[PDB]
Amino acid sequence: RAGGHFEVVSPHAPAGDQPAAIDELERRINAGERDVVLLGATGTGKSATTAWLIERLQRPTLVMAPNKTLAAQLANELREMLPHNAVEYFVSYYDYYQPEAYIAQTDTYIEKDSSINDDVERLRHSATSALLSRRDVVVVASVSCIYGLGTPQSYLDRSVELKVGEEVPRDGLLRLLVDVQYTRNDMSFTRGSFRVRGDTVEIIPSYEELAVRIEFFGDEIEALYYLHPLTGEVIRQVDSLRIFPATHYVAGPERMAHAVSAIEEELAERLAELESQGKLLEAQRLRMRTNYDIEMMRQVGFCSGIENYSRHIDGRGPGTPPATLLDYFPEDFLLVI
DNA sequence: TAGTCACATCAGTGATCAGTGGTTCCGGAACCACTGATCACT
């Protein structure tokens, strides 16, 4: 995690309680205080104090807010004070979301339905990449953060970097693009997708807004270039760049194998459980749904309900905390709630 | 008794297009000139 210094551009002049408060909070955190409280009255500007504390500590910060409403107004403001560091975002990426719900009394299956937002997931993946690519990363998170996730381990593993001049098989590059959830959209150009024409390859990464054109000298990386996605305007050129998986359900083929194994084992477990319960209808419905799900893992590796198998994918045990953006954070990560 | 909770998609469902199957339709009297009798003569 390469942590660039949190360059603070604050034309405001701190006064009143700001200096003493920041100093005492700083020494508080220095004192190993795993539990701290702040009394910030209205108009006291908690955002600036949090930014300065993050600057002093130089740790990847996770800030916790209770509703997506709040996150918006603050994160943009901090970017003004931090125009040279990774400022990020994460909340529920759902314009709408009915859960997988079950009216037991009526035996009614209100199936999980969701109108999926785009920019929310974009910023989610940008945040995960930034955390697993640099230490100067600040992320605003809804409680969703503590829900089940994939492993930042595999997140950083599946990611692959390419540099100008280095020999690299283009076909292997496409293979790893597929393995990191990027589609060979040879028809049009879309987010997290890409197209191949001759040695030329043009890709929009899922987290990175812009696109990139790579020219190939046979099976060698001829050159890399930033781009506007559709117009293709080369923003600039850099020798090397990394790509992270477009999914947070990152998992090597071996991790998919282990997840499938544990899924089948706990599937037998739940089969016996519902058989004893006498809930044969529910048992069979779950059985066939997960049968289709595992079929299209063994074929594709992608579907709905993948999260429900996080304990298998992450591989940790039942009842333990599933993977989290906290794992995406270091142990010396800054935390604010 | 109650506000937030958030981890996509088989399968209709037909619109709608957008390809395929087929449509369909006029002017005919002119124009080019060609062709079997009829007195004629023998």
Swiss-Prot record:
Quaternary context: Forms a heterotetramer with UvrA during the search for lesions. Interacts with UvrC in an incision complex.
Gene assigned in the entry: uvrB
Similarity-based family: Belongs to the UvrB family.
Highest taxon of source: Bacteria
Comment on protein domains: The beta-hairpin motif is involved in DNA binding.
Functional summary from the UniProt entry: The UvrABC repair system catalyzes the recognition and processing of DNA lesions. A damage recognition complex composed of 2 UvrA and 2 UvrB subunits scans DNA for abnormalities. Upon binding of the UvrA(2)B(2) complex to a putative damaged site, the DNA wraps around one UvrB monomer. DNA wrap is dependent on ATP binding by UvrB and probably causes local melting of the DNA helix, facilitating insertion of UvrB beta-hairpin between the DNA strands. Then UvrB probes one DNA strand for the presence of a lesion.
Organism: Mycobacterium bovis (strain ATCC BAA-935 / AF2122/97)
Name of this protein: UvrABC system protein B
Full-length numbering of the shown residues: 23 to 359 of 719
Limits of the Helicase ATP-binding domain: 27-337
Binding site for ATP: G40, A41, T42, G43, T44, G45, K46, S47
Residues spanned by motif Beta-hairpin: 93-116
Subcellular location: Cytoplasm
